[PDB]
Amino acid sequence: WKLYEIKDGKVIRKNKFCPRCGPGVFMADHGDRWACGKCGYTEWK
């Protein structure tokens, strides 16, 4: 719930959605990379 903000009628997500498992998958916001903690898949920024 903390990662979910709401502004003017839309839900903002702090972390991004890992595309392998679909939505609902928050994954590492490391600043330099978007890493997923479930399998180690890393999409560098």
């Binding site: 719930w1 990662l3 979910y4 709401i6 009628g9 839309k10 839900v11 679909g22 939505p23 609902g24």
Partner: protein, 123 residues
């Protein structure tokens, strides 16, 4: 006792009892998501078919996001007066502030009814 800000309609007592019955039957022969981050994930995932929310939740933020997000995703929502009642209907000792049903199971006939009684509440 004024209703909190996230309230958009008044749920009668019989409708709250029916919602708790639906929660119990979905716990028995279906699937419910205890906890509010899981409910948010379900509503985002679209698996949530009805979001039951407690009215006496001391922190407003946990339940504040549910009404506008549910209305955005066209997933009906209902209220129950006590988070303790929602937790007891959830089969867990600790209080569950929000429960999103995924498979009503044998509660569908109630849930589809309750959803109907939800659809008249916003009008």
């Amino acid at each position: 006792m004024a209703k909190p800000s996230y309230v958009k309609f008044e749920v009668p007592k019989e409708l709250a009892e029916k919602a708790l019955q639906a929660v119990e039957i979905a716990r028995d022969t279906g699937k419910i998501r205890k906890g509010t981050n899981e409910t948010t994930k379900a509503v985002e995932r679209g698996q949530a078919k009805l979001v039951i929310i407690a009215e006496d939740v001391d922190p407003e933020e946990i339940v504040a996001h549910l009404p506008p997000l549910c209305e955005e995703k066209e997933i009906p929502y209902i209220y129950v007066p006590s988070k303790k009642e929602l937790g007891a209907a959830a089969g867990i000792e600790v209080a569950a502030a929000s429960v999103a049903i995924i498979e009503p199971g044998k509660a569908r006939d109630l849930v589809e009814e309750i959803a109907m009684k939800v659809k008249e509440l916003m009008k």
